[PDB]
Structure formats: C-alpha cells, structure tokens
Design a protein around this ligand. Structure first.
Ligand SMILES: [Zn+2]
Length: 598
C-alpha cells in the first residue's frame, strides 16, 4: 500500500514550488522594494495553502504504522507544518509583521557623530567599521545608542504580535510553544540540558578571558570608563552585539610586542578582491576532493555591495534554489580577515546544498540546524592558522615563538569561546517569551539581565522598559533560530578535531602537531568524511550524520577545550600575576526612566 510514489511526486512539486518562493525572497533581499515584498509574501501565501491542502491529504496514507521508516520519516516531516498551520488571516499578518521587522532592520541609517549632515551610514560599511576601529568610548556609545533605538525599539509592536502568532502556530502543530518547536529540530528531548552542561564546563574558561579582557580595557580606556568587578560596557568590545571581541585585539592581546595575526592589511596591499577571496574559498573545497562551485554560482551571486542607491539585505547568506546546481551567495564582502572567514562559512552552506541535491526535497536540509553553520567554520579554522596563512603568502615572516602562540589561541578565544554564552542567551531569551515565562512589562530587562547573567556584558548607556533592544540583532528581527550557532561552535571543533586526525596533521602526542595549527587543506580523507556526512542531508537523525563522519554519536565540548587548553592554563596564572578580578556583580543598566528636566 505504498506511499513512496506519492512522496516522490510530492517532493518534486514542493521543490518546484519552493524554487518560486526562493526567487522572490532573493529578488527582495537584493532590492528592497514594496513590489518585491508583496510578491514575496504572495508566493509564501500560495504555498501555505498548498501545504495545508497537502497536510489534509496525508490523512489518506496512514503512515503512523508503515513499514520502511525512511518513508515514514518523510511523512512526519511534511505533515509538520510550521507557520502554515496558521489560519489564512494570521499567516498574511505574520508575513507582514515579519516583513516590517526585516525591512526596518535593513533600512537603518544614522548620521556621522562628526557630521549631522550625512545621515546615510548603514550597519554594513560605515557603522560596523566604526565600532571596530574607533577607541573613543563616547563615539562608540553614540553609534550604539543610535543603532539600537532604530533597529530595536522602532519595532516592539511587530515583535510582540510575532511572539503571539509564533506561539499560536506552535500549538496548532502540537508544540508547547515555538520554544519547543525549534528544539524539535535537534530531535532529542534532553538537548537543552546537554547544551547547559557543556556551557557549564566552558564557563570557567569564559571568565578567564572575560576578567582579563576587562583588565586591559580599564587599563586602556580608564577607571571612570570601565570599572573593575562590573560588567563590561559592550561597545568597547568592538562588536555591536559584543558577540565576538577579536576586533579589539590591538589593545587586548597577551603580547602586543609579538605578532598578532591580522592578515587584513596584506590582503589589501596584495590587490585582493572579493572574487579572489571566493576563488580561494572554492579551491579549499576542491582541494579536499569536494564539489566545486557550479557555473550558476559565479553568474547568479552577488559578492559585492551594489553601487546604486538601492536598499537590500546585506547580512551575508547562502541560498539553495532547489534545482540542480543553482546555488548562490549574497554578501557585501570587504577585503578583511573576518570576511575571509565569513566567505568560507557561507561556502560551507553551499557545499551542503550541493552535497545533498539528489536527496528527496524533505531531506534537502541539514542534519539538525547545527551542522549547516559548522561546515564552513571548520575550514575557516584552518585558514586562520599561521601554518596555512604562511602557505598562501598572507603571512610574511612569522615565528611561532611560544608566546606568539598565546596571541593566536586567545584570538580564537575572542571569537569561538566568547560567543558560546552570547549565542545561548539569544534563544534562551526568545524561548522565555515563546514560553509565557516573562511579562510584557519586563521584556527589555529580561533581555539584559540575561546578557548580564551569562556574558557579564551591559549596555553603554542606561536602558529602560521604554526601549526594546532584542531586535537590533539581525536574527531576532529576521526570525532566524539562533541555537544553531551555539551547537555549531561546539560540534565544529569535533569535526575539525577528527578532520585533522583523518589527515596527518593532529596527534594528541606529537608536540610538533598542535591541534591549533593543523591545516587540513588538500586532504582527501578529510573531504571524504565531510562527504559521508553532508551527502546524507537530514535523511537520518543527526547522531548518524555525525557517526558517518567519525563514528562518534554524541555532542560534546571536549574539542574546544582540548584546543584552547594551552591558552586556558595561561589565564589562571596571568590573571593572578596582574591580580585580575574574576566574575562581576549584577548590572544597573536596565531601569524605567529618569529625567533632569521638568
Ligand atoms: Zn550560516
């Protein structure tokens, strides 16, 4: 009484149809006009009805008792509607309040702190450039206050209706709330606890970095600016969301006299262009016997920020068009070291799309959202090593010293370790909303006390419940689950650890092969494992995807630690030599107003 024939035909129709939706989403995010927005939401609306209409057809085929579970896996998968279980009126209203946040974020503009006439700097070039190169706390605060008021506050209404709808659509699909809805993606009833245990294990490591980073800032910026024992005024951390601090390694690194790998300047002097960066990114993959970027990629991709007065979404991303070889990336690439890692990250997504094209539509996605983010990140870890950067000439003369080693792990610490708690709070925050755990009157402080609790970070200026900051973060505004990044930073080190071993680069004993200096570039057995894994495409629960890569079947934090071990035992000692304060007392940055004028 097969249903295989039905699923085959179905996926082909879903694929054919999601292609049309993707083209509008893409046209829109490349040129933000009302027409494209309307069409975009229009495709999503037609599809939503087709889904409902297919949700009721499966009543026919009673899969909840079938034989082969590959087929029965597909049914549980497609029957699971998302925001489509939502009645027609709400759905269009969701597409809308959602559209309102997304466009609001992308259209933000502020005026130079030094020219109230310009008012045309965006978050991509200008503003993010300032928060990363400026060492004027007053100016940095300026850009923080201006961006948060526009990208966050301006959209509390949309955001509120979203949470209410997001929750409604959750219960219509039998989930307790959107919170458990996202977690279903990891297919493991104890995933939140697994993720709580690992954070608990690295937390001590996080504060040996935190307190230290707080020891230099207060030394650099001054007592009055950065206090001891108090949470670090974000905005001095070089990142608008302080999710990553590497941008301030020129005033925070362990050994300023020794080298600080910052290949940005060399790329620039060497006539580097986004295209070249993409080609380099493409070689790394082919070098591992992995799939090369198809011809549609170089034709249909946007690797440079448009030069017309257009408004677009330029938060780097990778698109699967659901055909054969139609993969493209949209990025406002700039020639800097961070962008080079981002390029690879994105390519990571592209490798994944290519690796699993042949899979039934329902499986043309990652094994749990985490794997999708990690792929490219494993490669970026290699192009970040003095080893590989020397091999491509982006690092002239460099001596591994010993303390030059401390300036590399620590860097990767202001990126890979610092993030873990940030990424956790993002969803931990949206979860507590999805789950009616927080009252509307406490929505903005629930966010900061949570940024305080886990990261020891606070706004540069006082904020109150009148403001609404969570939306200043792209993923909050664009409705993108975030737990994916946190698992990705955990499991990407497991992938990387094994990949380097499957290659002759890492041996727990051989001291001439430290796990923080293996390149895996041009490694066939490494790509081959990446093939057994990526080719599966959500065809099996994530434990098997992992197993196919290295035989292990459990998510763990043994990787990161084993990587940053030489660094960890450098802080507990250095932080005692400079007599550095660990931990912080609660914040006073959230309140409910106060004025000095009648
Ligand atoms: Zn990504």
């Amino acid at each position: 009484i097969q249903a295989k024939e039905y699923l085959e035909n179905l996926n082909k129709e879903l694929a054919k149809r999601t292609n049309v939706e993707t083209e509008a989403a893409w046209a829109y995010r490349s040129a933000i006009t009302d027409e494209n927005e309307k069409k975009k939401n229009e495709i999503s609306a037609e599809l939503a009805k087709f889904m409902k209409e297919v949700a009721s057809d499966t009543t026919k085929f009673q899969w909840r008792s079938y034989q082969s579970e590959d087929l029965k896996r597909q049914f549980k998968a497609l029957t699971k509607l998302g925001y489509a279980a939502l009645p027609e009126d709400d759905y269009a209203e969701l597409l809308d309040t959602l559209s309102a946040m997304e466009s609001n974020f992308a259209k933000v503009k502020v005026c130079d702190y030094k020219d109230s006439t310009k008012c045309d700097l965006a978050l991509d070039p200008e503003i993010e450039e300032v928060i990363s190169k400026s060492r004027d706390h007053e100016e940095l605060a300026y850009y923080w206050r201006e961006f948060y008021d526009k990208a966050g506050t301006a959209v509390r209404s949309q955001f509120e209706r979203y949470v209410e709808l997001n929750t409604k659509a959750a219960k219509l699909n039998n989930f307790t709330s959107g919170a458990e809805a996202w977690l279903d993606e990891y297919e493991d009833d104890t995933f939140e606890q697994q993720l709580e245990d690992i954070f608990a294990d690295i937390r001590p490591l996080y504060q040996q970095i935190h307190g230290y980073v707080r020891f230099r800032l207060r030394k650099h910026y001054g007592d009055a600016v950065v206090s001891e024992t108090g949470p670090i005024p974000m905005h001095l951390l070089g990142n608008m969301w302080a999710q990553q601090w590497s941008e301030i390694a020129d005033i925070v690194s362990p050994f300023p006299e020794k080298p600080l790998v910052d290949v940005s300047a060399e790329m620039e002097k060497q006539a580097y262009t986004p295209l070249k960066m993409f080609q380099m990114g493409d070689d790394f993959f082919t070098s591992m016997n992995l799939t090369k970027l198809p011809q549609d990629f170089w034709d249909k991709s946007i690797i440079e920020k448009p030069t017309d007065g257009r408004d677009l979404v330029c938060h780097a991303s990778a698109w699967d068009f659901y055909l054969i070889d139609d993969v493209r990336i949209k990025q406002c690439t700039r020639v800097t070291q961070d962008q080079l890692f981002t390029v690879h990250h994105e390519l990571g997504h592209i490798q994944y799309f290519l690796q699993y094209q042949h899979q039934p539509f329902v499986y043309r996605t990652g094994a749990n959202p985490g794997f999708h983010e990690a792929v490219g990140d494993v490669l970026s870890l290699s192009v970040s090593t003095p080893k590989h950067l020397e091999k491509i000439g982006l690092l002239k003369d460099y001596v591994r010293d010993d303390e030059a080693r401390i300036n590399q792990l620590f860097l990767t610490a202001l990126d890979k370790i610092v993030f873990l708690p940030f990424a956790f709070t993002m969803d931990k925050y949206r979860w507590s909303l999805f789950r009616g755990e927080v009252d509307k009157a406490n929505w903005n402080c629930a966010f900061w006390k949570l940024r305080d609790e886990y990261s020891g970070i606070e706004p540069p200026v006082v904020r109150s419940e009148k403001d609404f900051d969570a939306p200043a973060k792209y993923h909050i505004s664009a409705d993108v689950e975030y737990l994916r990044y946190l698992v990705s930073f955990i499991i990407q080190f497991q992938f990387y650890k094994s990949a380097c071993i499957k290659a002759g680069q890492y041996d727990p004993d051989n001291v001439e092969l430290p796990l923080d200096n293996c390149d895996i570039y041009g490694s066939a057995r490494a790509g081959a494992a990446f093939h057994n894994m990526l080719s599966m495409g959500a065809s099996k629960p994530w434990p098997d995807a992992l197993e196919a890569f290295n035989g292990e079947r459990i998510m763990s934090g043994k990787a990161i630690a084993e990587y940053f071990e030489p660094l960890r035992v450098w802080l507990e000692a250095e932080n005692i030599k400079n007599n550095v304060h660990i931990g912080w007392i609660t914040s006073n940055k959230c309140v409910s107003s106060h004025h000095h004028h009648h």
